[PDB]
Subunit: 118 residues, 3 copies
């Protein structure tokens, strides 16, 4: 899985261990091994949510499967929780785009995750 | 709705009021309330369009519904117009990816829109 | 087509000619004219792959058509090869999300690539 967070919160406000915490928590939530989880945090961004520049975050979570109604609600509770406690961003100022990726559309290690057909 | 603009134009060339103009015009164009519109502008990027480093922009607009043939042509005229007037980027050096999001695939406020 | 590379490798490590090499090689691989290929390289990013901060890259390739099983494996071999040779990133620390875009969902030049029906 791949999780990206873009926020106007300053870099100094990102706590040590944050990328590791996201990796570990996402591994647990998705059931995927941590070795396969990638995380990218982008602070100091020029952005607004509802016309306001108060702290906010625009994010995305891509995963091959493990994406759906109930799971996404659960992912959001988890992620909004972490953004609120770690970056002090209010949950109602957080957007998370979820993408259910097809294995053939995810490249890795010189190939893709579609290794069964030619 | 969520709108992102990545450009090689320098930050100093982004005019005061740009994020607000984007927010209000997108609210108008999509019919969505402005308090739910999010905008992200990323200047000073290392990018090329057609192999050239002249000003350009790579964007995306995500919306739950309100995405389609005519509407997207409408959004593109509006957005290219703004990028041309405000950031001096030629419309033919602008790409905008449109995404019609399913409500269950958009997280917000500890839950999703489903 | 549009190709984005986000990486924790420093800017200084991006070699002169990289954006042009990506443009030319992607034109070749997708069969699309180079004039329509857009590339964006984002170095010095705060990111982790598998919990580690060793060099890695999270990428995306968007194209109207020319996206599929065999083609994506070919794009991955090409792109991981370039990232390994030019940015010294291990192919197993690279993820590339492929997006087959519908022409009506790609804006350009005040309109979209859907010019047939209105
Ligand atoms: C085999 C499927 O499981 C995995 O490890 C995955 C890797 C992965 C990489 C990139 C990505 O954008 C989305 C992803 O989702 C996954 O489930
Ligand atoms: C007002 C109802 O719809 C909304 O609020 C929306 C929010 C939203 C968030 C994130 C996103 O990627 C795309 C979105 O599109 C919308 O229509
Ligand atoms: C005319 C030949 O093809 C094109 O123009 C294309 C442009 C394009 C723009 C943005 C994008 O995200 C993906 C794209 O894929 C294409 O094939």
């Amino acid at each position: 899985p791949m999780f990206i967070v873009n926020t106007n919160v300053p870099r100094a406000s990102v706590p040590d261990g944050f990328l590791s915490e996201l990796t570990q928590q996402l591994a647990q939530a998705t059931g995927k091994p941590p070795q396969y989880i990638a995380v990218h945090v982008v602070p100091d961004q020029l952005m607004a949510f509802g016309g306001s520049s108060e702290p906010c975050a625009l994010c995305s979570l891509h995963s091959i499967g493990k994406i759906g109604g109930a799971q996404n609600r659960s992912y959001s509770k988890l992620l909004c929780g972490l953004l609120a406690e770690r970056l002090r961003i209010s949950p109602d100022r957080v957007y998370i785009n979820y993408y259910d990726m097809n294995a053939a559309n995810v490249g890795w290690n010189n190939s893709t995750f579609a290794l069964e057909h030619h």
